[PDB]
Each structure stands twice: as C-alpha cells, then as structure tokens.
Specification:
This is part of a larger assembly, with chains A, B, C, D, E and F. Chain A is low in regular secondary structure. Chain A has no helices and no strands. The termini of chain F are far apart. Classes of the chains: A little secondary structure, B alpha+beta, C mainly beta, D mainly beta, E little secondary structure, F alpha+beta. The interface between C and D is small, with 3 and 6 residues. Strand 6 of chain C pairs antiparallel with strand 4 of chain F, so a sheet runs across the interface. The complex binds magnesium ion (54 copies) and zinc ion (ZN). One magnesium ion binds next to loops of chain B. Chain D binds 3 RNA strands through strand 2, strand 7, strand 8 and strand 9. It is classed as ribosome/ribosome inhibitor. Keywords: Protein biosynthesis, Ribosome-Ribosome inhibitor complex.
RNA sequence: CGUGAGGGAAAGGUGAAAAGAACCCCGGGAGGGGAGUGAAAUAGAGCCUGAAACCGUGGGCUUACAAGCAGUCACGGCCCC
RNA sequence: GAAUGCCGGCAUGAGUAACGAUAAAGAGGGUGAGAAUCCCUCUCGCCGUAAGCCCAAGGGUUCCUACGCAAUGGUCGUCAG
RNA sequence: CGAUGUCGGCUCGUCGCAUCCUGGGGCUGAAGAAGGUCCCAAGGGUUGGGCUGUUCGCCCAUUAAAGCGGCACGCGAGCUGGGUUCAGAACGUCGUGAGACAGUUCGGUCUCUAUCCGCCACGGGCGCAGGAGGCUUGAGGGGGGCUCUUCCUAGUACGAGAGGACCGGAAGGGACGCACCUCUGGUUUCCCAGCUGUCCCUCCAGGGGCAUAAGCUGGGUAGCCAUGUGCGGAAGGGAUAACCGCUGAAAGCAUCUAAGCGGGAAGCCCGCCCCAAGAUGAGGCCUCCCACGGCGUCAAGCCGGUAAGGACCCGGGAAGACCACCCGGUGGAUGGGCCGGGGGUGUAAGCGCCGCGAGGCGUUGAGCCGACCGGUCCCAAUCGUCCGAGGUCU
C-alpha cells in the first residue's frame, strides 16, 4: 500500500 | 419466467450444444449404447429418434438430411442398412434411457444409460 | 403517434412545408397525438411569401400518421408520413385546399371542411 | 348471486354490428351442487359447486359421495358461491344470458421472482451517463436516522404473480349451451386451462 | 477487506441455530427384485438388470 | 375437455368462404363497407398485397397503394363481414412471404422485381373457362 | 526478506534401558484393533507434566404467546447427594 | 483485563465469496484399491506475424527414465514442472 | 475531529396543513357567468420543455391545478460528480517576494462479498391436546380513492345588450391502476430461406465447421410483452366537518341548544378488490379412521407393527432460485418419440426440358418444419419402502 494517494474525495 | 418453452439449455451456446447433440448421436449410432448424465441422456432421445425415423423412410433426400448431422458417409450407411430395418414395424421410440445407480465422484453427476431399443 | 419534438408534414397550401410538434392538446399531459387530435407546433420550414412564416407558433390538426390507427371494425390503416393541416382557433383551416389523403377519423371528430377539401378520405 | 365454475379455453375476436371483438371463450360446464351451505348449520349462505368429472377412483375415502349427485366426484369441487341457492341441482350455464355483466376470478400467471420495475413499474436507473450497475435498481428505500427503518409496505422485488385476481363488469357476448360455452370481453386472468369462476357483477343486480 | 462487515461475532447459540437445517437426509433405497441387495429405486440394479433392455450385468 | 382448440374453432362459424385465394405479391382490389356519416358507401382499395399472417379465422392481410403522391397501407381481417368482395387484378411473382421491402422503392424497381406470375395467371382464366363450359345446361 | 548495504526467525525433554511394538486382523495406504515390551502405552515416538480459549460425543434439568447488560432476590416444580 | 500493546494458539463472518480469461467439449476402451481430471481411439472446438519453430538474457536439474502420491497442484489425480 | 461524506440532480418514497386543484360552505361592493375573501376539508392529483452546476427564478406551450414545507437543507454500505473541495495550469487582482482570493477559468482514482435490526418474498419446526382429506367464517390488515371536455335540459332563468346558471341526465377523453395476447406491434439463440470468404466431407452435385459468446442478411409460431386489448375510480348505506334549519326555554319576546330533532363534504365507517386461524382468543361445516399386541400394576407416558391417510422415489408443469405449490405415475396420455392439424418459411433434393454460359422452367406451395391443439402405450413414470389414531380431567 504505502499510500501514496492524497486525500482527494 | 421463461414459461412454455422447450429444449434444455445445457450450459452451452448454440453451436456447441448442437455439436454435443450431434456427437452423442454418432457415438450412440456406433456402439448402440452410451453412458452420459441424465439430462444429456434425456435430450438425446428426440435427436437420435428423428435421425432414425429418417433412415426408415429411405429415400436419397432422407439420406442427405441425416448426413448433415452425421458427416460420416459410412455409419450413415450402417444406419440406413443395418440399424433402420430393425424398426420398420415400430412407430417411434427407437431409443431408451435408464438411470444408473452410481454417481460420478468429485463431480456428483447422476449418470444414465442410453441405448438403441430392441 | 406524435409527441413534442416530432416533425410533421404540412398538408395544405398555407405556405409552410414542415412543423415541429410543441405540445399535444388532449389533457393536461397527453403522451401522444393521433389523427384528429389538435397539436401546437413551431414552423421550421416554409415557402417564400406564404400565409405563414418560419417561427410562427401555430395550431394544427393531425391528418396522417406513420403509426397505424386501428378502426373498431378490426381493420387498420397507416400512411408513409405524419401530416397536419394548420388551423385557426376556430379549428378552421387557414389555407384553402388540402393535399393527399386523410383518415375518416378526421370526419368523426368534426373536421368537415378538411375531408371535403381532401382528394380522398380513407 | 348466481355464479359458476369453468376453465379458460382461449381467446378470439368476434363480429357483431360490424364492430369486431373481443372475446375469451370459457366453457362453464355443468356444475353439480355437492353441498348447500345454510345459516342454520354453517351460519352463512352458499353452495359447493363441483366441476370437472373424471377421477377413476383417485378419490380418497372422505369423498363426500353423500348427496346423491356425486356422479363420480369431480376434480375441482373447489369453491362455493356465497349468497347463492340455485335450482337445487346442476348449475347449467343458461343462468347467464347475453347482455349481462359478469365478474371472472382466476389465478394470474406467475412471474416468479420478479424485480421491481416489473413487479411495480419503477423507473430504475439511467441506461447510460453515470450508470454503475444500478440500471434496474429501486434507488433509495428510505430516509436516514429518523425513522431509521423501512416502511411496512415498501414496494420491493419478490414473487410477483401466481395469485387471485378478479376483473369486474365483464360483458357476456354470447352463451352456447350445446357445448357449455360462455363468452366475455378479454380481461380474464390465468393461463389457458386454468380454473376460473364466473359471477354476476357487483355493479348492481 | 471492504464494505459491509459483521458487527459482532456471532455467538455459539446462534451459529448452531442456523445449522438447524444443515442436517442430511438418508438415501432412499428399496430391495432389489432378483439379488437381495439394496438399490435406489428407478435405477438399474447394477447386479441384476431390467426385464427387457439390457442389464449389462456384472456377468 | 381435450379439444381446447376445436372448441375455439367452433365459435368461429363467422368463417368466410366466398373470397378468392391470393398470395402476397399480387395486386388485389378489395371492395370494403364504409359508413361515411349515418349512411354506408362501398369504398374500393386497390394495391399490392404485401403480407398475409395466417392464424385460421382472424388471419389478416395487408394491401399497399400510392395515392396522390402518398403511400397508404390498409390492414383487413380476411373474414371481415365488411369485405363486400375482393377480386384479383394481376398475379405477381412473390419470391418471399412478407415483402415489406417494396416500401422503400415504390418506383420502377417495384415492377421487374414483382413480375407477372404467368403460371398462376394462365390458371385463373383457363381455370375459369372450364367453369364457364360447365353448367351451360 | 532486500538490487545492495542491511534486516533477521521459529524450533529443547519417550523411557532407567528402544526393550521403538515381531505376528494376526480392517485398510491401497495412512491409521486403527488385538498380541507383546515396560513400573507406567491418554510414557507410542508431530512422545514428561497436558492448563485455558476453541471443537466434539453422552447424560441431567430447561425452552417454540414470547422482549432480552443476561444477572440478582423470592417462592415454586424436576434431577442427584 | 485493557496500552488500534507484543508472541503464540483457537474462534467469528461460513460451508458463505471464490477456485485466475466465455477457445468447448462428447464417447468408447484401458490401467487402477480408488478415474469428468492419467494413457489410447474416434468425433467436436481454438491459435496459426501464433497460443507454431530457432536463438539471446535470465533460471540452474526443471531434461530422459524407473519406482511412487504425505505434501506442492486452487477439485480429483493412477498424472506432473 | 482513534471521521456524522458536505450542494444539486436521479431513484424511491412518506408525512404536516398554515390547500394549488377537485368536494362542501358563510360574506361579497355575489344579476348571470367569472371573480374576491374567510371557514371546513387533505382522499387523490399537482405536465413537458429552453437557460443555468444550480436550489430558486425567468421565460416557451399547456393545464382542473403547475401548492408549500418536514423527514441529517430525506435518500452517495442506492446511482451520478456538473458544482464545491487536494496536488496541474491560466486570467484579473493583492504581496518586492514565496504565494493568496464563498473572484473566475480548463482539468482532475465514488470502495465486488450485509453479521444483527428493518423491509420485500419463500420455506423448515412445533403448536391448535384423537388422527385425517377437503370446503370455509373474517377478528384484523393492505390496495384503491384523480379529473377534463362536449351535448341535452336551453341557449330558458338572469341580463339594456354582451353573456349565460343551478339542479338533473348522457357521450367522449387525459394520466393512473390490475389483468390479458384475439387484433395491432415487438423480441423469438437455430424454425426456414438467401449470401460472402474460407477449410473440409469425395471430383460434380449436395452439404458441414468457422467468420460473437447468432458469420451476415430476409422473415418468423409459442412464450414473454406495450405502443395493443379488456376492466377499474364507483353506485349505495350509516355517522359527521364547516354551514343551513325545526321545535325551545332560562331572559313574557328572540335565539339551531342549555333536553332534544333534522339536513349537510372527492373527507370518516361500511360496502369494491387482495391477504388473513400463530385470531396460540389457534374458529366453523361436510366426509373419513377407529379400541392397545405388550411395559409405567398408580400421575403423565413408553416400545410397537397398523387404520383413514401422508411422505419417500419417478414423469412432469404458463408453479418455481432451493424449497414450496399443482397434475400424473401403466387398472396411466405425464414427458419423449411417432402421426394428424395449426403455424413459419417460400415452391427442396433428384430427374427432365431450354440456354454457349450465369441461369430459367416443369415435376411443386414443394421440401423442411421448436414451444401451440390433439391422437397414439413405440420409449420412459418398473419394483417397492417408510411414516403414521388407538382420544388428559369436572
Ligand atoms: Mg420452463
Ligand atoms: Mg459460432
Ligand atoms: Mg412462471
Ligand atoms: Mg430505462
Ligand atoms: Mg452499466
Ligand atoms: Mg446512507
Ligand atoms: Mg498396533
Ligand atoms: Mg506419562
Ligand atoms: Mg521425567
Ligand atoms: Mg504429553
Ligand atoms: Mg410456553
Ligand atoms: Mg485496568
Ligand atoms: Mg482494528
Ligand atoms: Mg493474533
Ligand atoms: Mg452471507
Ligand atoms: Mg449467496
Ligand atoms: Mg459461487
Ligand atoms: Mg482456470
Ligand atoms: Mg493405481
Ligand atoms: Mg479458427
Ligand atoms: Mg528437483
Ligand atoms: Mg519431464
Ligand atoms: Mg490435491
Ligand atoms: Mg492456484
Ligand atoms: Mg509412471
Ligand atoms: Mg469532528
Ligand atoms: Mg468510532
Ligand atoms: Mg385547515
Ligand atoms: Mg367562496
Ligand atoms: Mg439545443
Ligand atoms: Mg445546459
Ligand atoms: Mg439547498
Ligand atoms: Mg415532500
Ligand atoms: Mg437546513
Ligand atoms: Mg441532505
Ligand atoms: Mg459514492
Ligand atoms: Mg452505512
Ligand atoms: Mg468536478
Ligand atoms: Mg506586482
Ligand atoms: Mg469559494
Ligand atoms: Mg477559498
Ligand atoms: Mg480530458
Ligand atoms: Mg460500494
Ligand atoms: Mg441490531
Ligand atoms: Mg404477437
Ligand atoms: Mg461454406
Ligand atoms: Mg460444390
Ligand atoms: Mg468463436
Ligand atoms: Mg417481425
Ligand atoms: Mg386452525
Ligand atoms: Mg405424453
Ligand atoms: Mg426440386
Ligand atoms: Mg406437420
Ligand atoms: Mg389409448
Ligand atoms: Zn438385481
């Protein structure tokens, strides 16, 4: 996983 | 729904199903008895019966029609010569299904007998 | 069956060649318009200098239709086009003479002058 | 109030006064009254009617041959008529004359497990645009925290059809007594072959 | 690893309560006319065979 | 009970038998009863028969004509009491049952595609002359 | 495990002595039942002691008009000392 | 007795979802303690600028054969990498 | 704040009335028609578009009317993601600057698996104290509940004219609801035919595989369907709301009320349709079966082969996810075959004749031919097995 996605929705 | 309809969808598409029926008949015309599952065996009657009734009448047209479902030029011979005349005074029901007592393991399939009648 | 957005052919010499249905006048919310019903329509195409110009919000009676209409005698009839006759608020045709056939449904709804003017009533 | 049993034969269009159709032929064969219910004994008023004969002894022992009319007990003894006390014996079919209005009760065809939007005409989803797998779903089925539950009649999917349906004020177009035939105006429920019962209408009479 | 998820471990009494119908039914069999063996009805007795169309008997 | 259709076939005593045999492709003029306000006038419809869907009684057939620059189709009950008569005007070679296709070429290609049915034509007359020679007594 | 530098586990005990179970029996085996070794065989070898969660089988009481932080306090019946 | 504690063990959801391309299977005969699944024959379908051949890299015994099925195989398995 | 997803749209609704319409009514500066205003009333209904992310609103065409709000500004473990609301970028603007702006602009990852409640469906168990097969009562629920237009009365009443009632009656409609497949019209997956390329069966002829999971095209029964067809809203009875009165005191008169008694709403109760005896308050009627061979010598029972019957199993079914339900199971037409009839295709193959040939014609509406209506024991529902009362007390 490690994210890395930014908090979008 | 799918009410007053007829013919088992045997979890096969149109051309495969047709092929199945067509193969089983070949087999059942060759050995005279066959083992398959019950619904496959309950569907072969109609199909093999009709081909036989066609060999009964005898004419060259009748040959060429049967030949569409059997492709083998012999075997159709066998049909028209040896198989056919055995049923001449019999009107219909050239075939028999008897349910076997043992079930395929690791599958669970109820099996059935299918043989040419007489 | 005609509903709002449907092009109709203009079957009289009022000048217009085609109207588009704006509304069907039966109830508060009629879904469709058949022969003998009255519709409101915008004009979309016309003949130069006629009685009606493009844009003219008009009224008109439906005289032919592609969908077949069923007669209570068990017969039916359908036409190659959808056609209307532009009429005024007295339900009278603002044009003289009408082109091509109209259904008897027209006569039964009281549009006498149309069926007279019509070449053939079927 | 006169009633009788029957099967649905089929449909056809008929011609009378130029105007054509429409009719459902139903044979309302002879019904031999097998019992006559009365307010002194049962507390209400009716007549068990008994329908198609057959039964070469598939009849059990309770049978109720009793009333000397049990001419080899019928298959469908089902249904009385309620507030009906006929000529004492065998309800013919000549009870309905043409012009009369009638009420057929039948058993509707069974759609089985039917989605909402066939069960109930729901609008379902858009066939495109946003889509995502709800093309035929019922949408929302409630509010939020209050009431925090779903209503006790909420139209959802399930076994639709195969039930009792009665359509009223049907016209009798003709009766053919030679063959126990009865005719009406289309609306009659059930498949061909089904048992149906036919009463005079609640409209009046 | 996603959306709906069990709220509370289902207790022992409730697990066993749903298996109240998990029970098997014994196979239904009948005496074979010729041999004394048992056979599920309407099946070709493996040992003896039907009167008419062939037994294909173990023989 | 075992006669569910023979039963239906019984009400159908409205069956017509006077009308001529005809099959799609050939053109036929059908004299039809029409009210036209209180009265009752006998209108004629003459076109190419374009479809016959048989169902015993309540078989229908449909006829197609171009009138005043517009195509019109009419659909008749083969046993409608309103059909006064119906008489063939030319016998055409069909080559297909439902020939809806001609809706999209009502021109020159409509003939030569529906050419004369010589074989059915040379019956229709020679088949009548014998019926003219019989009962001249 | 990581390209690499580097990270880095788990896993001890039959019996005094293998005396580690010949042989027969079911089974294709596995594994059992007898027989036998041993003081002990739930010391039999995925072996000392064998705790709890957990899963079974049998018995006693109880339960299908019933509302539940599951207990507690009263009476009551049944079962065992 | 608690630290979304640490290690280990066993539950719950649950016989539920799934069993990895919708290119497709049917039958006869063998072998076997045991075959939808292994061998053979016949019939059917699929790829064919490949889903066919030959190298390079990488892999390091997977090659051939004999004897085998506890596990590895998403089922079976007499087969096998 | 160890997370309550935040606008609008779609979907599905339901609720309040301080009602937009329809029903009833008082006053009117109400002639009539049409309005104005207030009271009663929510049963039902409350359109489709153009613009904008829009809510709202403005418009277009209608309408009986184009009602207003609550339900986490209802509804994202239902959908959407245009807006808003990350990271990119640009404009205007502010800051020397990095950057900033409910100012703007274009773009921008919406999470397969429901455990408990709840809901829609369907069964398994036990119970209803004798066991059965049927047929039923309806406590109690649910559904439904809309409205327009024209004509007759009469173009009278009313009105100078123009307009034009009530009451009563009739015919067409618009949406909505249940059911249906005769007609209209769809699909119909191998029912038939035509066609192309290619490989094959054997050369010709004739055919087969593949070209989707139908190769393409032309049609098409049943079945399932709406555009199609038939019905439905009611009648009517009873009690009321506002409101209109009768008789009538207290208070000689007067007053609809304080005793009474009437009228009077699409509303209320019932009637119409559907569910419904778990309605443990387990109902009723009709017809079946009856003694216990043995133990508990006592209370309730137990072991047990039987009875009326009922399952198992099998053939099936416009019944159906499984289950259930229903019809059969050979003293039998249930399914399959066969035959007959429908129905669909459109006149097969082979031969003959004409044409150099592609072809055409004849034999011929031929041949082929699923589901539909029937007939026929040719094939399969063989043989059987297992449950099942023997009735507590006044
Ligand atoms: Mg079916
Ligand atoms: Mg294919
Ligand atoms: Mg069904
Ligand atoms: Mg849609
Ligand atoms: Mg989609
Ligand atoms: Mg939510
Ligand atoms: Mg041992
Ligand atoms: Mg020890
Ligand atoms: Mg020790
Ligand atoms: Mg130990
Ligand atoms: Mg109790
Ligand atoms: Mg603590
Ligand atoms: Mg956690
Ligand atoms: Mg752990
Ligand atoms: Mg689950
Ligand atoms: Mg599931
Ligand atoms: Mg699955
Ligand atoms: Mg796979
Ligand atoms: Mg082996
Ligand atoms: Mg290929
Ligand atoms: Mg190795
Ligand atoms: Mg190898
Ligand atoms: Mg394995
Ligand atoms: Mg795997
Ligand atoms: Mg080997
Ligand atoms: Mg917070
Ligand atoms: Mg929390
Ligand atoms: Mg109010
Ligand atoms: Mg007023
Ligand atoms: Mg536009
Ligand atoms: Mg826009
Ligand atoms: Mg808002
Ligand atoms: Mg609302
Ligand atoms: Mg708010
Ligand atoms: Mg909200
Ligand atoms: Mg979402
Ligand atoms: Mg949630
Ligand atoms: Mg956005
Ligand atoms: Mg600057
Ligand atoms: Mg902002
Ligand atoms: Mg901001
Ligand atoms: Mg883009
Ligand atoms: Mg999700
Ligand atoms: Mg809960
Ligand atoms: Mg149809
Ligand atoms: Mg080819
Ligand atoms: Mg060739
Ligand atoms: Mg393919
Ligand atoms: Mg079609
Ligand atoms: Mg009861
Ligand atoms: Mg049969
Ligand atoms: Mg030929
Ligand atoms: Mg036939
Ligand atoms: Mg017979
Ligand atoms: Zn035997």
């Amino acid at each position: 996983x490690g994210g890395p996605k930014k908090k979008k929705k | 729904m799918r009410h007053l309809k007829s013919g088992r969808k045997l979890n096969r598409h149109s051309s495969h199903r047709l092929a199945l029926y067509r193969n089983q008949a070949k087999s059942l015309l060759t050995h005279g008895r066959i083992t398959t599952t019950v619904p496959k065996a309950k569907e072969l009657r109609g199909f093999v019966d009709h081909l036989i009734h066609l060999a009964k009448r005898g004419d060259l047209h009748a040959r060429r029609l049967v030949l569409r479902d059997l492709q083998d030029v012999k075997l159709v011979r066998k049909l028209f010569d040896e198989i056919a005349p055995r049923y001449r005074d019999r009107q219909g029901g050239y075939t028999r299904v008897l349910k076997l007592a043992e079930r395929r393991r690791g599958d669970g399939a109820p099996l059935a007998l299918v043989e040419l009648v007489e | 069956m005609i509903q709002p957005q449907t092009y109709l052919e203009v079957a009289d010499n009022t000048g217009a060649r085609k109207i588009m249905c704006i509304r069907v006048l039966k109830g508060s919310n009629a879904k469709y318009a058949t022969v003998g019903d009255v519709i409101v329509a915008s004009v979309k195409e016309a003949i130069p200098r006629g009685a009606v110009k493009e844009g003219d919000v008009v009224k008109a009676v439906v005289v032919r239709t592609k969908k077949e209409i069923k007669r209570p005698d068990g017969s039916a009839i359908r036409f190659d086009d959808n056609a209307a006759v532009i009429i005024n608020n007295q339900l009278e045709p603002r044009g003289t003479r009408v082109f091509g056939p109209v259904a008897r449904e027209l006569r039964e709804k009281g549009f006498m002058k149309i069926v007279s003017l019509a070449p053939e009533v079927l | 109030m006169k009633g009788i049993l029957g099967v649905k034969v089929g449909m056809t269009r008929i011609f009378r006064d130029d105007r054509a159709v429409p009719v459902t032929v139903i044979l309302a064969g002879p019904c031999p009254v097998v019992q006559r219910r009365t307010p002194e004994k049962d507390g209400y008023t009716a007549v068990q009617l008994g329908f198609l004969p057959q039964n070469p002894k598939r009849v059990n022992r309770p049978l109720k041959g009793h009333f000397a009319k049990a001419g080899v007990e019928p298959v469908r003894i089902l249904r009385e008529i309620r507030d009906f006390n006929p000529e004492g014996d065998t309800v013919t079919v000549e009870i309905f004359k043409p012009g009369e209005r009638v009420d057929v009760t039948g058993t509707s065809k069974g759609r089985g497990f039917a989605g909402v939007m066939k069960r109930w005409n729901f609008a379902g989803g858009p066939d495109s645009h946003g889509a995502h797998k709800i093309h035929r779903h019922p949408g929302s089925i409630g509010n939020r925290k209050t009431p925090g539950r779903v209503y006790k009649g909420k139209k959802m999917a399930g076994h639709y059809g195969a039930e009792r349906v009665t359509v009223m004020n049907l016209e009798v177009v003709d009766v053919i007594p030679e063959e126990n035939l009865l005719l009406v105006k289309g609306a009659v429920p059930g498949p061909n072959g089904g048992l149906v019962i036919v009463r005079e209408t609640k409209k009046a009479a | 690893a996603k959306h709906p998820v069990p709220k509370k471990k289902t207790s022992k009494a409730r697990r066993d309560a749903r298996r109240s119908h998990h029970a098997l039914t014994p196979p239904t069999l009948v005496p074979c006319p010729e041999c004394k063996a048992m056979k599920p009805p309407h099946t070709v007795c493996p040992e003896c065979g039907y009167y008419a169309g062939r037994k294909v008997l173990e023989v | 009970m075992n006669r569910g259709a023979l039963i239906k076939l019984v009400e159908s005593r409205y069956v017509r038998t006077d009308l001529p045999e005809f099959r799609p492709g050939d053109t036929v003029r059908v004299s039809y009863k029409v009210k036209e306000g209180n009265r009752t006038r006998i209108q004629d419809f003459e076109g190419i028969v374009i479809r016959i869907r048989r169902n015993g009684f309540n078989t229908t057939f449909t006829v197609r004509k171009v009138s005043y620059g517009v195509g019109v189709e009419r659909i008749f009950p083969l046993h409608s009491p309103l059909i006064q008569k119906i008489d063939i005007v030319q016998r055409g070679r069909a080559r297909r049952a439902k020939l809806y296709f001609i809706r999209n070429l009502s021109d020159r290609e409509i003939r030569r595609k529906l050419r004369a049915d010589r074989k059915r034509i040379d019956q229709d007359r020679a088949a009548e002359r014998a019926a003219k020679e019989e009962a001249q007594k």
